[PDB]
Amino acid sequence: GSSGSSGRKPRTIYSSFQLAALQRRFQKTQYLALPERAELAASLGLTQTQVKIWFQNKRSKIKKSGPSSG
């Protein structure tokens, strides 16, 4: 649109430690309650604004085929 979110780096947008728990939590449920979403931000050391976009984006890029659009 204006700036464009582009870039290439070996360090995934998220660390292995943060991801592990994240993905491990997502598989359980796509949505996270109040204290549930904060748990990842307080545990992984991230913020609700980060764990939120991570859970949302994923839903769109769900390795699993079916619900995703095309």
Q: Is residue 2 part of a domain?
A: no
Amino acid in position 36: E
Domain count for the chain, please give it: 1
Q: Give the separation between CA 8 and CA 23, rounded to whole angstroms.
A: 22
Q: Is residue 9 part of a domain?
A: no
Q: Give the separation between CA 62 and CA 54, rounded to whole angstroms.
A: 11
Q: Is residue 5 part of a domain?
A: no
Give the range of the structural domain holding residue 45, as residue numbers without chain letter: 14-70
Question: Tokens in use for 30?
Answer: 């796509």
Q: Is residue 7 part of a domain?
A: no
Residue 35: give its domain's CATH number: 1.10.10.60
Q: Is residue 42 part of a domain?
A: yes
Residues 7-31 as b/e (b if ≥16 CB within 10 A, e otherwise) read: eeeeeeebeeebeebbeebbeeeee
Q: Give the separation between CA 70 and CA 56, rounded to whole angstroms.
A: 17
Decide: 55 and 26 in contact? Cβ < 8 Å. yes
Q: How was this structure determined?
A: NMR
Q: Is residue 68 part of a domain?
A: yes
